[PDB]
Structures are given as C-alpha cells and as structure tokens.
Amino acid sequence: ATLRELRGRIRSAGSIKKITKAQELIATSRIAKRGLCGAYNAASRRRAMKSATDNADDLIKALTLAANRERQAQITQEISEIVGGANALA
C-alpha cells in the first residue's frame, strides 16, 4: 500500500500546486488593480502563493523519487519471491 499512498499524495500535491500557481497569477493581476497571505496578518498573497507553489513542486519531486524507489523495490521483491520459489522447486 506504500506505493498507492505515495501516488495518492503525488496527485494531491499536483492539484495543490495547480491551485496555488493559479492563485499566485491572480494575485499578480490584483496587485496591478481570506487568509492565504503568508505572514501578512501575523502582494503578500502573491509571494505566499509563489512560496506554496514552489513547496508543492518540491513535495511532488520528493514524492516521485520515493514512488520510484518503491516501484523498483517492489519489482525486485516480486522477482525475489518468484525466483526463490523456482529455486526451491529446482
């Protein structure tokens, strides 16, 4: 279930990235003319959503690397089981 969970997380992160990039562009437009504004309460929305888009990109990259490690490892483990059975039947 590890690979399935990782793929679900990759899909979630991709959707979040798309939404945050759209919001960053909308904030760019609104600058020329809610609480997603970074440390504003504690322009700012544009920077916060650019940061969030970059963070989601990094998350997608890391999750994809983990997913590929898991995919390779599953192939290797499956082959190990198959060949172990074959050897024991040799």
């Binding site: 939404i19 759209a22 562009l25 909308i26 609104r30 082959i79 060949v83």
Partner: protein
C-alpha cells in the same frame, strides 16, 4: 501407416510429457487418444513437453501419442466472414462447416522491411477523438490501452461498425474485413459483442476468433495468431484487414502460465524471457504491403488492460514500445463524462497526418494546441473575467472542443460528418453556442446538413477536401440553422 509414436510419461494441469517421437518438430501438433490435441513446446533428450489444447482431463500416463508432421496451422478463406471459430479455425457458433480456401501456418514470417510501403490510407474509426487526434492508417498498429471499464472494447467495436459503409461500396480497395479476437473473455461477453456487431450489420465482413476464459491456456495463447493468420490470408490477396486483439494481456498471462508449467525460467512479473517476442512477432504481421505484393494491409488494434493506470508495467511497456501509437483511456475522464475517455494529452499516432484525409488534416490542425492550452488554463475557469481576452477565448473554445469530441457509444460517424463537426468546433461556430448544448447542436446540424444540404458531404467524400465554395455554403447553412436552434437556456445562438 507406420506412424512415429511416443508415450505419455506424465501429465498435469494442461501439460503432458511424452517419451519417443524422436523426429518431432518444435511446435508440432500432436494427437493424443480421444482426439485430443497438443503442441510440442519443450524438446529435450528425455521427452517432449506438450501443451494440451483441450480436454486435458482425458490424458493419462501410458497413452499413445502420434505426431502429425505439421506445425500449427489454420484454415483460411472468405467463408470465415460472419463466423465464430476457435483458435484452430473450428466453428463454435453451431452453424455448420466452414469451407476453407487454403491453410496457413500460424508462424509464417511477417512481411519484410522491403515488402512494405508507407502507411498512407485512413482507417476511419468513426470516433472523432481518434480520427482527429490520433489518426490510424491502414497497416498501422494502434494500441488501445486503459484500465478496465474505460471503453476499450467499445472503441474497437465502433471501429468495426464504422467499416460498414466501406463494405457496402463493394470496392475491395475501400472494403475492410474485420477480425475480432476474444482472448479469455466470458462467453456471454463474446455473445454480447457479436450481438452488437450483428445489429450494426458488421458480421457481413467480420470474423470472430474466440478463446473464452474456460478454454485451455494454449487456446488463449494461440488465438491472436489464428486471427492474424486469417487476416493475413486476406492481406496477401490485396484486401485490407482490421484485426482487434481483445486483449493481449490475457494472452500474455496464458503464455506465462504455459511457460511456468513448462519450468522455463521466469523474469520480471514471472514472465518468460520471450513474452516481448510473443507480442512483437504477433504485431509485426500487421503491415501495409507494397504494390508488388498487392498493396493489401492489416491494421492492428491490440487492447491492453492496465491496473491502476500503471502503463510502466511489463506487458503495457512492451506493447507500447511495439505499436505505432497509443490511445490511452482513463476512468477519471470517463467519470467526468468525457466519453470516449481518451486522454488526448498523452495519446499519440506516429503515422499522424499521413493517415488523415486532407479535409480532416485541415480542420483538425489547431485541435491539439487548442486542447493543450485549454488544459493549461482550466485552473483559471472561475477567474475568466480576470483573464485577458485571448485566454478567456481559449478557455471557452477548449470547453466547446472537449464537448465536441464527446461521442455516444455504437454511433461512429462518417469522415465527412466528422470533418463538418470539427469544422464547427475549430472555426468558432460553437462560440455562440452554450457549452452544455454543443453536443445536441452538433448532432442537429449534422442532421440538417444531411436532410437538405447533402452536397457538402458529397463534395467532402468524393474530393476528400473542403472546397472554398463548399465551405461558404456550409457557413451560410450553419448561420441559418443557428437562427433555427433553441438553446436549452432559451438564449439565441445567433451571431
């Protein structure tokens, strides 16, 4: 008649080991008592390992096995049209004998690299998404790949049904003979497919090779080759053939089963080291022959079922590498109402525009980029006012084009109708039409044009081009019909 004989030395789950038969050939057909048939796959010093093609429970140690002196072969001829046969060419539809013109060995080599010519003739599927985005030419191998229940069989059946007008022309250069190979399918599923083909009058020109799920693994392994041999007989006689393999995943599973039972070394996913060879040998027989050999062709539509949409699995990877293009179907698109559920962003035809007629090539030129831009902009759907005019127009046009590519099942369209529909989409004639109405609008327009302006369709079909006069007449007809059309929200679609 002084026959060479061997003896069954062991038998288990569809495999028999037979001593003797010193002169047996690799892949030779063998006869076991009770009219049981086997295939010699493993030849060694001690015995011959044989795949039993049916009634394995009849086999017993000590039974006499005879060699036939012949590798696997099947009868072939025109009489197989409209019939359902098993991978040995035997009818299973209960409709009597099939008169065979001749016999073909299943493993005859594919046409060579100098016995072909470039794929240049459209194989119209009648499905707008395919005929515009990933066109298929005669001689091409176009993989239909997707998860279960994504509409793969529906697309193949629609293609076969679309060949009916071509059949009725009576001209062998336009006619397409269809072979449907069912591998591992439930018998009533095959019956449903045949019923669908009969309703659309496709069994006139269609043969079904059936290897249902209850058949021996040998039959499932052999069925694609049998369908290929039947089709090849026509291909080498100047005919054009469309063969559907539904589906090659089941055939690979059957071959893996046989190989493991034969103790052949397993690799990734436990497949033998020649599964790629299995499918590539099958699919390279689909070809477009040169004029020296009669110019016939066979178009392959292998179907692959992915699990959780993992196209990097072993067998999908192999078949994707083998084929000339891929139609990826997706269940998420299917649930979104995008039917047929083809992912135009990842689907490809390497033959491309060479497989389209000029009119389709023209009207469909901008489709790919329009759809890509729409997919990029979809995030900004709710901010369309904030979008600049160009991006807003791109968003609206993409929505309308996505509606345009939708198609009901069992209803393929003629190439002229497809051209007119895509012309509506890509010439901005759907811009004034509400998205939710596009489909209906299109259908009605196509009805209208067929009722009173057939000359447009006639010009497109005869010339394969949309002339300037035809285009202007079509535009005026569109605007008049727009005056006539009632949007579901009541707003006029005029201007």
């Amino acid at each position: 008649e002084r026959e060479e004989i061997g003896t069954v030395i062991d038998a288990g789950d569809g495999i028999a080991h037979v001593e003797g038969l010193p002169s047996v050939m690799t892949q030779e057909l063998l006869e076991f008592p009770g009219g049981v048939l086997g295939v010699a796959l493993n030849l060694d010093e001690h015995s011959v390992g044989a795949v039993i093609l049916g009634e394995f429970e009849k086999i017993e140690e000590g039974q006499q096995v005879k060699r036939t002196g012949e590798v696997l072969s099947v009868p072939v001829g025109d009489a197989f049209l409209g019939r359902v046969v098993n991978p040995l060419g035997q009818p299973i539809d209960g409709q009597g004998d099939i008169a065979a013109e001749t016999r073909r060995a299943l493993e005859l080599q594919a046409p060579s690299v100098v016995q072909r010519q470039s794929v240049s003739e459209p194989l119209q599927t009648g499905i707008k998404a395919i005929d515009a985005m990933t066109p298929i030419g005669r001689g091409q191998r176009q993989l239909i790949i997707g998860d279960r229940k994504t509409g793969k069989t529906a697309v193949c059946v629609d293609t076969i049904l679309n060949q009916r007008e071509a059949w009725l022309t009576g001209d062998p250069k336009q006619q397409v003979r269809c072979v449907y190979v069912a591998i591992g399918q439930k018998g009533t599923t095959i019956a449903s497919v045949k019923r669908a083909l009969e309703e659309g009058g496709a069994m006139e020109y269609t043969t079904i090779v059936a290897a249902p799920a209850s058949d021996a693994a040998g039959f499932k392994w052999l069925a694609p080759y049998t369908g290929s041999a039947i089709g090849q007989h026509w291909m080498y006689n100047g005919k054009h053939v469309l063969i559907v393999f539904d589906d090659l995943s089941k055939q690979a599973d059957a071959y893996r089963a046989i190989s493991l039972l034969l103790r052949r070394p397993p690799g990734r996913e436990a497949f033998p080291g020649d599964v790629f060879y299995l499918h590539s040998r099958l699919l390279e027989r689909c070809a477009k022959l040169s004029d020296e050999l009669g110019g016939g062709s066979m178009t392959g539509l292998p179907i692959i079922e992915t699990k959780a949409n993992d196209i990097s699995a072993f067998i999908p990877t192999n078949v994707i590498s083998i084929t000339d293009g891929q139609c990826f179907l997706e269940s998420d698109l299917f649930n979104q109402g995008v039917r047929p559920a083809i992912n135009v962003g990842v689907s490809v035809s390497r033959v491309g525009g060479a497989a389209q007629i000029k009119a389709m090539k023209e009207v469909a030129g901008s489709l790919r980029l329009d759809l890509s831009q729409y997919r990029e902009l979809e995030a900004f759907a709710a901010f369309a006012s904030d979008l600049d005019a160009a991006s807003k127009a791109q968003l609206d046009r993409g929505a309308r084009l996505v509606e345009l590519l939708k198609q009901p099942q069992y209803s393929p369209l003629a190439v002229e109708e497809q051209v007119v529909a895509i012309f509506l989409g890509t010439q901005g004639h759907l811009d004034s039409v509400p998205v939710e109405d596009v489909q209906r609008f299109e259908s009605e327009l196509l009805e209208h044009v067929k009722a009173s302006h057939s000359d447009i369709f006639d010009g497109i079909r005869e010339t394969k081009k949309l002339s300037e006069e035809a285009e202007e007449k079509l535009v005026s007809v569109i605007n008049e019909f727009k005056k006539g059309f009632q949007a579901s929200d009541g707003s006029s679609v005029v201007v």
